[PDB]
Amino acid sequence: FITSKIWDGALAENNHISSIGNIMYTNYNVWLILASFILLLAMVGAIVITIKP
Amino acid sequence: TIGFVYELGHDALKVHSRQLKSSVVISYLGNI
C-alpha cells in the first residue's frame, strides 16, 4: 500500500472523535434521538420487571 | 434526564429502604 501527503486537506485535522462530533448532533441527530429513546426504554423496562413496586 | 427522574422517583436503589397515632379513641357516655 502506498501513501502520500496533502496540504489543503491537512489544514486543521480533526481526531476521529472530533469528526464524529461534527456530524452526530447535526447531520445525523435522528440516530441520536432514536438511540436515546432506546436507552430510555431499557432503563424503564429493566427496572419495571426486577424490583418490587 | 427524564429516565434518571424515573430512577430517582421510583427509588430502584431503595433510597427509603430503612425506616404514635392511635387508631382507638374511647368516649364515656355515663350510666344507662
Technique behind the model: cryo-EM
Q: Cell numbers at residue A51, please?
A: 424490583
Nearest to B3 among A40, A51, A53 (CB): A40
Separation in Å, CA B18 to CA A41, B7, B8, B31: 29, 18, 16, 49
Between B2-10 and A29-50, two packed helices, what is the crossing angle to 10 degrees? 10
**A48-A34-A43 Cα angle (round to 5):** 20
- How many angstroms separate the CA of residue A26 from the nearest CA in chain B? 20
The enclosing H or E element of A27 equals: none
From the candidates B4, B10, B13, B15, which should be mutated to test the interface with A, based on the most A CB atoms within 10 A?
B10
